[PDB]
């Protein structure tokens, strides 16, 4: 650096005085960089014990001692002997003077953290390991971990270091409960960090799966966070990762991915089936490349979910598991149904006079044997009797999955008995009314439970209404989700009072989660069950998006669901402001429906405005032309928006090609190409191409003709000096459109020209 | 600060002897102003100086100056000291007048009033009729030295070689003592 420093001092300080004090309270690192590199060269010379330690600072002695302020916090601490006093430039917590036991909300990055990266690397590591040595002796006071969560570049450059740290912490499952590592980070890691390296995230998935399996987890009653994080991360990775990264998971699925997470496995295979469409990974061959999926099929048939038994298994290139049709055994051959009904009747009659015996009777759980009795209890005005509650919370920690499975099956079977409407009045008056307070399931596992049987062809005509009342079931708690709109969206990146905000929120409204709303004779408050609660139930959206996907893309035969989903989005708009991936969300909805979309498009003509309407619930100031298109497409949509589509095409391809030096990358992209899905402006091209005109018969042929008119015909706006870039952009677009669009193009080209 | 300048003229008089003179007086002194010969940082720090070595007028009908040394970063100076060619009277008056004019323009431009100091050594016996012929200055070698000494108390000392010619006596015409007192068999003192 000696000659580099010499040349820099020559070039930059090209004058005869000491000008430019350059206070620059907003940002002065660039200005004081000369002083910092001077100090660093002097420190290096002193460490080398030679070159007279670069003496005579007479030239810039003014800037050299400008330190004697947040802006003046130019930390040269990294060298040595500056970790006590100069570290105090950043205000730490107060431990000497005297849930919500932590003042001093977190600091913002752009202010000062934008530069100070080389110093703060593993300071908190010592703290977390010192805590992990003995135990979590006290409720964690440091909430500054929020800032630590907003640190991507550190692991991005020191992946080896964090990997070694994780490997050294791994024995904490034998050391102390493996508790002090997971709940500290997992929720912010899943919330504050959305984009991450695929190999890294799949290794983290494997590690969390292994930790969930071993050691013992039955004591972690709030482990639902782990499941939510796993399902939210596994959905955000299935775009273009499987085919390149197969070599990175050759053996990891072969060892452990199906220990206990059956629901997670089903969601994974659903995401896989969704991905397979893009881009023809299995369409070419039949079973040559099927070796990658045969092992997964074997692992899932080891527990055999997804047993449609070749009824509507159409969203696949070739259904291979379709051979195993006899594993369904639906409702136990329709005959054991009445037998288990009489069995649970007899068990209730015995339970009338076996209170001291039902404890030793409910050993092994027996999920599809006993839990069906729950319909009889709470029908007698909260007949809990607290006899089995403790035994349940003690034993069913794992079997709760099958328990709620059987419970959902039984309840849907009981409600299906309407069959015509003669019960609907009884439902409205008593049945749906009593189920409100206070259901313990809290809509956790109902998704796959419903998907297993309600989507079956057997009684779809009534399972439809079952689903319909299910989505309309929330009418007392949905108000909280409604008013929760102006709580996260106002403050999601510009944190100023989020700490106290969520503190007050999770303090005032809720009272408890594990106990019931009844106050017994003695009530010791002792509020301690609150380790970490930054988000109370906003997280449910990341799981609900797959639900809304599977309820539309899979359930589409009946149209009145359109009237339901529009109200659903009108109510969950504020909840939708966490991510936007419409490409995988809409592309798969046209895998084989183009020949018949007319039926679906008759309502999609409104669903397009519904989807873009829900998308309007976002204020980043990132769109200034789609709204103009909307304005030009608000009256008589069957006349106007065909012709000027060429104009929109030229505009969007100009925005694309101008990614380098023009003025288009101005007010459109901003703030800060970190979490708004910008690894590349690529997806911003395909953003609207599909949703443009799916309302009318525009797709199929007219779309392709319009896309090609800018080629064979000299468009007025098209300039003849940059054709190549424009053709490149058109290719970029068309590579991301459904099959028929880019299929008919070939035929049209070879049609008459040749 | 330590803004000192070095001027020599005995190149034509004694070439090989100049090498030993350097390695005995200037090269050790160069380490007093540098952390070690490498490069090194050099800029407008006040401590910069000049390097003036030329020849006599007899074998010079078309060339007298080829100097280029704004700062030299305290390295290029000692670098070209060794890498210099060589070649009665000495004509050192012209070099002395040019160095005087240079010191004057420095004091008039490089102010901060600045306690200017300088040292001059010349083994060749100097004698010439012309003095400057380039500026207001006009006179002789004796006039030049009494001007450089008496008019302004420019700190100057002369540590001549162990050999002594018939010039030291005449060089005592300056009211400020030449201060040849530092004559000791011990090695070159850093700063007496």
Swiss-Prot record, chain A:
Disulfide bonds: none annotated. GO terms for molecular function: transcription coactivator activity. GO terms for biological process: positive regulation of gene expression; positive regulation of T cell extravasation; positive regulation of transcription elongation by RNA polymerase II; positive regulation of transcription initiation by RNA polymerase II; regulation of DNA-templated transcription; regulation of transcription by RNA polymerase II; RNA polymerase II preinitiation complex assembly; transcription initiation at RNA polymerase II promoter. The keyword Transcription applies. It comes from the Eukaryota. The keyword Nucleus applies. Keywords: Activator, Disease variant, Intellectual disability, Nucleus, Transcription, Transcription regulation. One of its GO terms (cellular component) is mediator complex. It is found in: Nucleus. Transmembrane segments: none annotated. Belongs to the Mediator complex subunit 23 family. Required for transcriptional activation subsequent to the assembly of the pre-initiation complex. Component of the Mediator complex, a coactivator involved in the regulated transcription of nearly all RNA polymerase II-dependent genes. Mediator functions as a bridge to convey information from gene-specific regulatory proteins to the basal RNA polymerase II transcription machinery. It is linked to Intellectual developmental disorder, autosomal recessive 18, with or without epilepsy: A disorder characterized by significantly below average general intellectual functioning associated with impairments in adaptive behavior and manifested during the developmental period. Interacts with ELK1. Component of the Mediator complex, which is composed of MED1, MED4, MED6, MED7, MED8, MED9, MED10, MED11, MED12, MED13, MED13L, MED14, MED15, MED16, MED17, MED18, MED19, MED20, MED21, MED22, MED23, MED24, MED25, MED26, MED27, MED29, MED30, MED31, CCNC, CDK8 and CDC2L6/CDK11. The MED12, MED13, CCNC and CDK8 subunits form a distinct module termed the CDK8 module. Mediator containing the CDK8 module is less active than Mediator lacking this module in supporting transcriptional activation. This is Mediator of RNA polymerase II transcription subunit 23. The chain holds residues 392 to 1173 of 1368 of the full protein.
Swiss-Prot record, chain B:
It comes from the Eukaryota. Residues 1-192 are annotated as: Interaction with the Mediator complex. Ubiquitously expressed. Highest levels in brain, heart, kidney, peripheral leukocytes, placenta, skeletal muscle and spleen. It is found in: Nucleus. Component of the Mediator complex, a coactivator involved in the regulated transcription of nearly all RNA polymerase II-dependent genes. Mediator functions as a bridge to convey information from gene-specific regulatory proteins to the basal RNA polymerase II transcription machinery. Mediator is recruited to promoters by direct interactions with regulatory proteins and serves as a scaffold for the assembly of a functional preinitiation complex with RNA polymerase II and the general transcription factors. Required for RARA/RXRA-mediated transcription. Component of the Mediator complex, which is composed of MED1, MED4, MED6, MED7, MED8, MED9, MED10, MED11, MED12, MED13, MED13L, MED14, MED15, MED16, MED17, MED18, MED19, MED20, MED21, MED22, MED23, MED24, MED25, MED26, MED27, MED29, MED30, MED31, CCNC, CDK8 and CDC2L6/CDK11. The MED12, MED13, CCNC and CDK8 subunits form a distinct module termed the CDK8 module. Mediator containing the CDK8 module is less active than Mediator lacking this module in supporting transcriptional activation. It is linked to Charcot-Marie-Tooth disease, axonal, type 2B2: A recessive axonal form of Charcot-Marie-Tooth disease, a disorder of the peripheral nervous system, characterized by progressive weakness and atrophy, initially of the peroneal muscles and later of the distal muscles of the arms. Charcot-Marie-Tooth disease is classified in two main groups on the basis of electrophysiologic properties and histopathology: primary peripheral demyelinating neuropathies (designated CMT1 when they are dominantly inherited) and primary peripheral axonal neuropathies (CMT2). Basel-Vanagaite-Smirin-Yosef syndrome: An autosomal recessive syndrome characterized by eye, brain, cardiac and palatal abnormalities as well as growth retardation, microcephaly and severe intellectual disability. Belongs to the Mediator complex subunit 25 family. This is Mediator of RNA polymerase II transcription subunit 25. The lineage of its organism: Eukaryota, Metazoa, Chordata, Craniata, Vertebrata. The chain holds residues 15 to 216 of 747 of the full protein.
